[PDB]
Curated annotation (Swiss-Prot):
Family: Belongs to the SCC3 family.
Entry protein name: Cohesin subunit SA-1
Signal peptide span: none
Top-level taxonomy: Eukaryota, Metazoa, Chordata, Craniata, Vertebrata
Superkingdom per UniProt: Eukaryota
Record's function text: Component of cohesin complex, a complex required for the cohesion of sister chromatids after DNA replication. The cohesin complex apparently forms a large proteinaceous ring within which sister chromatids can be trapped. At anaphase, the complex is cleaved and dissociates from chromatin, allowing sister chromatids to segregate. The cohesin complex may also play a role in spindle pole assembly during mitosis.
Organism listed in the record: Homo sapiens (Human)
PTM notes: Phosphorylated by PLK1. The large dissociation of cohesin from chromosome arms during prophase is partly due to its phosphorylation.
Binding partners and assembly: Cohesin complexes are composed of a heterodimer between a SMC1 protein (SMC1A or SMC1B) and SMC3, which are attached via their hinge domain, and RAD21 which link them at their heads, and one STAG protein (STAG1, STAG2 or STAG3). In cohesin complexes, STAG1 is mutually exclusive with STAG2 and STAG3. Interacts directly with RAD21 in cohesin complex. The cohesin complex interacts with the cohesin loading complex subunits NIPBL/Scc2 (via HEAT repeats) and MAU2/Scc4. NIPBL directly contacts all members of the complex, RAD21, SMC1A/B, SMC3 and STAG1.
Transmembrane segments: none
Amino acid sequence: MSPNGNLIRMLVLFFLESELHEHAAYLVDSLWESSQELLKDWECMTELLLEEPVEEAMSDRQESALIELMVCTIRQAAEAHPPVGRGTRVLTAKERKTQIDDRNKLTEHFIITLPMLLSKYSADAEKVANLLQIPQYFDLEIYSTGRMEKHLDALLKQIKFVVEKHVESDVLEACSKTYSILCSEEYTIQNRVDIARSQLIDEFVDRFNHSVEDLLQEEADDDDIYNVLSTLKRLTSFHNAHDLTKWDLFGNCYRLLKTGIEHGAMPEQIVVQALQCSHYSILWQLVKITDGSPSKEDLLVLRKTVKSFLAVCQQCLSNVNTPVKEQAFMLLCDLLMIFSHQLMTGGREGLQPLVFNPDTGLQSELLSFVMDHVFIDQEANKIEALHKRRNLLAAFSKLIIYDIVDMHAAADIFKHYMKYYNDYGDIIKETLSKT
Ligand SMILES: CCNc1ccc(C)nn1
């Protein structure tokens, strides 16, 4: 009760104070043979997190660590295997028996307790996003079984708060994922979640729409700009895993982008999101068209939409802010690959009118960006920034393989930049091989 609360308080301390375990997931996994009993005392943990002290309280760091540790114990119990990175699969009867029993325990528990955790920590983005990893492990059918409808409502109340309080992409994307989870994994609860969601959305589309109108008609306020971005972010995060086509978001994003080119002064993060949102509208419009049995005009209305958006992305290469360019670029290398001739794979030759081949002028800018923004001259930010430029290239590389840009102009740029490996490589190799 408090004997395990002593052991768990000091386990959080051994994690933080010693750099002997860098990743919580690996620490948990290592103790899991010898200390399963302790690590699945979820009541003990939620207690520590929710109670008020007698003496000695928990510090904001140790609170965070406990939550991260907790989530890893929840995962290891649900999945019944070591975390990704320590893997190697077949269970014994008693192991399989334990898996079910644990899954039941944490579900019943966290259904009750996760809304309370979210409530208490509703403004701590790292913490909130870490807690919202939990419902993916739920035995979701228990929302009927325990007559537990009361706490499904409660989680949904708290998710609605979180999305209303926050703009960080980790938190929002955590909320969206959690909705998808709660939706199409049980009919019993589906209709209930569907409503809280499409209300959540409605309240944000109306807010965004008024903000979009506010911004464009106005000289524009720091608020008019806050309002557009803040709402758009929420909707874009969600638009990835949720089909928001019924609200014509593409139209207003398209205006926002058009204003940013025309008059040249749209704030960078509005432009980036406006793009990403538009792209997700386009993917989802496509998906309904593949799976449906679409007409001549259906295709042609999507075509006009796609060509207007490829145009915007191209023009957005010329935006001063390099984040915009990379987004613009990313979407070009996605879309030119998506609406390539591979769109007539799998007996889908109805889709010919949706195919696009990029023009010379465009291809020359898709080459330009690589010389300008993959291949560049000069802590933690740079190992990260590199993997992105890697991705930008790998995304461009796909276009080159299937001859969607000029493969020869590309490899000429690869020549120009690999020069010193081809002029002095052997020499640098054998030198380094004797030291
Ligand atoms: C037209 C409404 N927008 C405004 C005005 C003034 C301030 C400070 N903020 N926002």
